């Protein structure tokens, strides 16, 4: 599915909404066709691969056991309650699958806040016992690079993979294992509304003339001050990001944000 030449990527889907996979399809310069045909060899990916069933499982086995080595990119939290049964693929629990495959990877990237920190299904009361990859697999020595966001900026995935392929090492990582080159600033310190924040100019409601004039969204719940991401700088889809669309940041690149940042419309 891959031998020499392009580095092999094994992409796994655990408890996920596939928004992280969709974010990678939005890759721009390079686009995803360049990535799949020239940069990398995408050797397992349930959303777009041709094989299904037993043939898909054999494709996975061939990739993981390759003497050329592979990189794992993991989307979704791992459900650990009740011995892992809330999530299975090919009748194996996602916990078993990731426990057997991720220790064999040359590098692991946990892509999206669900794979990094547990995400939406880990929000209280966490009925499926969902955990992020490093939490779930601590005991096996797995240390995934965490690229957070819900979904992350795909610029941050491609930039981390390019760095790793060039330097054969992870980039500098923060205390949440996220690359400092993308997650070293708060959203707020990069925000165009920062002068209004400083001036105490807050929109009191979304219908207000202050919201129309682009006043700061802190009183309406914005989590920009407590959230590390590069959204105002890179933007999304080469055109926009939440505060420029008039909506507060909900803190989506931070651990446990579903419970820490809620109610989303309060600060």
């Amino acid at each position: 599915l891959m031998g020499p030449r392009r580095p092999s990527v094994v992409y796994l889907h655990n408890a996920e909404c596939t928004g992280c996979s969709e974010s990678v399809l939005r890759a721009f310069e390079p686009y995803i066709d360049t990535l799949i045909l020239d940069t990398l060899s995408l050797d397992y990916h349930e959303t777009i691969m041709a094989a299904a069933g037993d043939a898909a499982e054999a494709a996975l086995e061939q990739a993981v056991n390759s003497p050329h080595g592979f990189i794992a990119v993991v989307e979704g939290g791992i459900p650990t309650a009740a011995n892992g049964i809330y999530g299975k693929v090919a009748n194996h629990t996602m916990l078993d699958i990731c426990s057997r495959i991720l220790p064999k990877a040359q590098a692991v990237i946990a892509y999206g806040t669900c794979a990094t920190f547990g995400g939406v299904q880990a929000a209280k009361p966490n009925p499926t016992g969902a955990k992020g990859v490093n939490d779930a697999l601590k005991h096996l020595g797995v240390k995934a690079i965490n690229i957070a966001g819900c979904p992350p900026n795909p610029y941050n995935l491609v930039g981390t993979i390019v760095y790793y392929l060039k330097n054969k090492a992870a980039p500098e990582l923060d205390s949440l294992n996220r690359p400092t080159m993308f997650f070293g600033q708060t959203v707020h310190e990069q925000c165009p509304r920062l002068p209004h924040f400083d001036a105490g100019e807050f929109a009191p409601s979304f219908e207000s003339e202050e919201a129309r004039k682009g006043w700061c969204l802190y009183e309406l719940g914005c989590k920009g001050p407590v959230t590390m991401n590069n959204c105002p700088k890179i933007k999304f889809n080469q055109t926009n990001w939440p505060v420029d669309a008039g909506h507060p940041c909900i803190g989506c690149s931070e651990p446990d944000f579903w419970d820490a940042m809620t109610p989303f419309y309060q600060n």
Binding site: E16, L37, A51, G53, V120, P127, P151, P263, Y265
Partner: protein, 534 residues
């Protein structure tokens, strides 16, 4: 010489989410089917007790393929619970983002999820690019030359000669397959357009970010309206319009001609994958509180009786659990819904899925493009009628052909074409409204301590509803009933096969080790298991 025995497809790939399909086949034909969804997250449990304004942020993460759709359904649901009537421009902007979602979603479905069931990409290496260009130019107003297609063939040849087939590893077509019928030239045209669509979908998704902040997972809806004052500006409107026009051109000149050429080559697929009953909720309202104000109207049809479309009564929905991994056997209306997981393993106590089994008046209902198209046709929708008639005439088949896996695939293209044109009408109405001096995008509202609400979206896979009970100003119950739950949920407590299960009966299977025929029918419904189970 034909196979008798079971076949299991786990994972079903080229869908959203985690699906296991099991069939029994007798003498080469499927005799029985089970649709088993194998991931549960429990978002309905997680929502209990929270602020109703937070619901859309959680429920949008039901699914990133049908991104936006659940934020819209939850916002419509809480709008409804609080009794706010959002401003006209909020309806326009929400509707324009939804129209853009449909175009992105269905383009990606046909090429990137469905087509590898019908296109042998490696046979494209054998094609004559000059002949293929002639064929591509005869089916579309866009001219394609031999050099255009050789560039694709050259890139593909470098890829395959590397020995690293990537997403094509162990494809069911490798080495040839009796159920793959396209000639090399048509495989090359489809492969070229698969690759083109990987870049065009970037633009189709960007259209949603122009007003909606980002894709995936938009961030511009609030109770009472939308937040994006920049969406009123001529520059953001021009940016959206340019992305829309290029996406529409691709729908009209690339997707629909390819759909018709592949359908024409697989006309035997009019004979498999039919279903009996159809439900649709309508979409693109003029009035948020009247489904019959929508450009597509709601309706219910039983036993293909399209002369007698029944009104949609939201109180006749019940979600069954008897064959699902939840406690007990009692079906519930979603305003009385229950999400009480209880796993019994595959077929333990006759349970085999994490999806509930929604029934309407006790019946299993297909929803999605085939239901939206057939019901709107039967309501006299003139755009739907024009496009569907032109498709049937181009394929040389009668209306009966629509009740099939091919027909459902065709209906997805029909609805894409119709929505692509209607997005320009909505955009003009929006422009006209701004020019009248209406610059309002959000309305004020108050949270009631006790309320019931429901929000209805006809999403790319069909009728989506979110249901809230507010108690003490908080979420007392929140239930999602999602299109793929209808279509791909399991049997109910009357043991009625769901639409996907019933549609599989009769499927021929040429090679049980490579059961592409099962994928063709399953993929024609465009399953989304994260949606179905939440």
């Amino acid at each position: 010489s034909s196979y008798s025995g079971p076949i299991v497809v786990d994972p079903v790939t080229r869908i959203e989410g985690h699906l296991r399909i099991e069939v029994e086949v007798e003498n080469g034909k499927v005799k029985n089917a089970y649709s088993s969804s194998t991931l549960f997250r429990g978002l309905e449990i997680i929502l209990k007790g929270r602020d109703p304004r937070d619901a859309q942020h959680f429920t949008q993460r039901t699914c990133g393929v049908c991104t936006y759709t659940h934020a819209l359904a939850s916002t419509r649901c809480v709008d409804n619970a609080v009794g706010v009537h959002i401003p006209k421009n909020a309806t326009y902007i929400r509707n324009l983002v939804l129209g853009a979602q449909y175009l992105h979603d269905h383009i990606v479905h046909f090429y990137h999820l469905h087509a590898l069931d019908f296109v042998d990409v490696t046979a494209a290496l054998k094609a004559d690019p000059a002949k293929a260009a002639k064929v591509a130019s005869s089916i579309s107003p866009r001219k394609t030359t031999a050099a255009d297609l050789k560039a694709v063939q050259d890139k593909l040849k470098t890829f395959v000669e590397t020995g690293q087939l990537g997403p094509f590893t162990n494809a069911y077509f490798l080495g040839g397959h009796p159920a793959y019928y396209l000639d090399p030239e048509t495989n090359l045209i489809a492969t070229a357009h698969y690759l083109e669509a990987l870049r065009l979908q970037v633009k189709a998704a960007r259209a949603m970010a122009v007003f909606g902040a980002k894709n995936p997972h938009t961030q511009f809806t609030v109770v009472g309206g939308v937040t994006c004052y920049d969406a009123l500006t001529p520059q953001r409107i021009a940016e959206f319009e340019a992305l829309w026009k290029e996406t529409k051109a691709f729908v009209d000149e690339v997707y629909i001609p390819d759909l018709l050429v592949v359908a024409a080559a697989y006309k035997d697929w009019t004979q498999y994958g039919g279903t009996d009953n159809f439900i649709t909720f309508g979409e693109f309202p003029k009035d948020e509180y009247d489904l019959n104000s929508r450009f597509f109207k709601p309706g219910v049809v039983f036993k293909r009786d399209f002369k007698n479309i029944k009104p949609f009564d939201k109180m006749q929905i019940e979600e069954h659990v008897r064959h699902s991994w939840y406690e007990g056997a009692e079906a519930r209306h979603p305003w009385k819904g229950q999400t009480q997981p209880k796993y019994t393993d595959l077929h333990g106590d006759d349970r085999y899925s994490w999806m509930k089994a929604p029934r309407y008046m006790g019946e299993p209902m297909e929803t999605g493009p085939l239901a939206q198209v057939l019901i709107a046709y039967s309501q006299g929708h003139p755009k739907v009628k024009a496009v569907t008639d032109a498709v049937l005439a181009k394929l040389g088949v009668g209306p009966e052909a629509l009740f099939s896996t091919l027909g459902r695939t065709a209906a997805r293209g029909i609805e894409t074409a119709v929505i692509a044109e209607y997005v320009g009408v909505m955009l003009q109405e929006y422009k006209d409204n701004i020019a009248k001096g209406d610059n309002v995008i959000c309305a004020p509202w108050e949270m009631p301590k006790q309320a019931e609400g429901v929000g209805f979206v006809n999403a790319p896979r069909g009728g989506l509803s979110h249901w809230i009970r507010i108690e003490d100003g908080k979420i007392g119950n929140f239930q999602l009933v999602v299109p793929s739950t209808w279509t791909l949920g399991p049997r109910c407590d009357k043991n009625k096969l769901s639409p996907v299960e019933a549609s599989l009966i009769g499927t021929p299977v040429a090679d049980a080790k490579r059961p592409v025929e099962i994928l063709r029918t399953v993929h024609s419904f465009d399953p989304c298991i994260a949606c179905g189970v939440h």
